[PDB]
Amino acid sequence: SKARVYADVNVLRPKEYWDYEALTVQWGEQDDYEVVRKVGRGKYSEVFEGINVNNNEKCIIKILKPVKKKKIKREIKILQNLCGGPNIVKLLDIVRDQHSKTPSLIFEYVNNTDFKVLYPTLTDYDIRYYIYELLKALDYCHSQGIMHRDVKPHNVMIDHELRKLRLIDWGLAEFYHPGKEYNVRVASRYFKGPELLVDLQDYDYSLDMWSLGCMFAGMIFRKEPFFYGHDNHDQLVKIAKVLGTDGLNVYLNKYRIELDPQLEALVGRHSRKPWLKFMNADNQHLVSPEAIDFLDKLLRYDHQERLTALEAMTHPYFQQVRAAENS
């Protein structure tokens, strides 16, 4: 399988663009940035609001836990390649502690409101607007030969007063090389695409489109997360209960894949459930026919059949967002 778009971007840019292991970091000055308060954390870092002591502007400081040189350079080189792109978080500086050699990445500040508190507030229009802004970022990174591999609401910072949106957490982003087999242990469980769950390794940018699909389903149906599985086998079961098993079987056969025997058994046999079956009184102001047609063209077992980020931006669901931009 190969990407249907931007397949050869890396193939014929100069090697330096994608050979992240040859990167040499230019270190800034640690004393330029002071920690103000803790704001978040992950398996790989603790994250602080900071201050730049020169201009007194806010920033974000990501203090990394011990990490292998290869891994960190992949993250840096990706951030540097994409810095300046629409709605990509800007990496402004990279510094380190002298004694411990502990690195910190310094980013622009976004005054985020936690999605679990923010999303219930959004209007139908705001949902279309923020999803369009996210699409701009995905088409951009895809066009530069990079898969993000971890799209989910936790990784999308939004200053709602400024109506600004940044895609963050590039810790799992990778360069796309046609026919390469990738590790399927990427993304976060509720947002993993069926190609990850059935061990199809030569995936591509379309993985991100599934994850965006899950986030969008969660927003319009007010069911977070939309596919609530407990481990990776159960995650494919939860998807098959909605998309139905006939379509799963077409996909596996098209790509010559045999599910593990016990996985076959947990999956069973299920009818496809129409998307209207999730509508209820609380969400009905969000589940209109353009929303469902758009969702249905992202949540497809077959990665090659999903909309590209560029085609998604043109879908009639976004027309008023485009009109306002054309002003």
Ligand SMILES: CN(C)c1nc2c(Br)c(Br)c(Br)c(Br)c2n1CC(=O)O
């Ligand atoms: C816990 N993590 C990873 C994290 N939370 C973050 C938040 Br809230 C903001 Br605002 C920004 Br800017 C970054 Br960078 C964050 N990072 C780092 C990142 O997104 O790369």
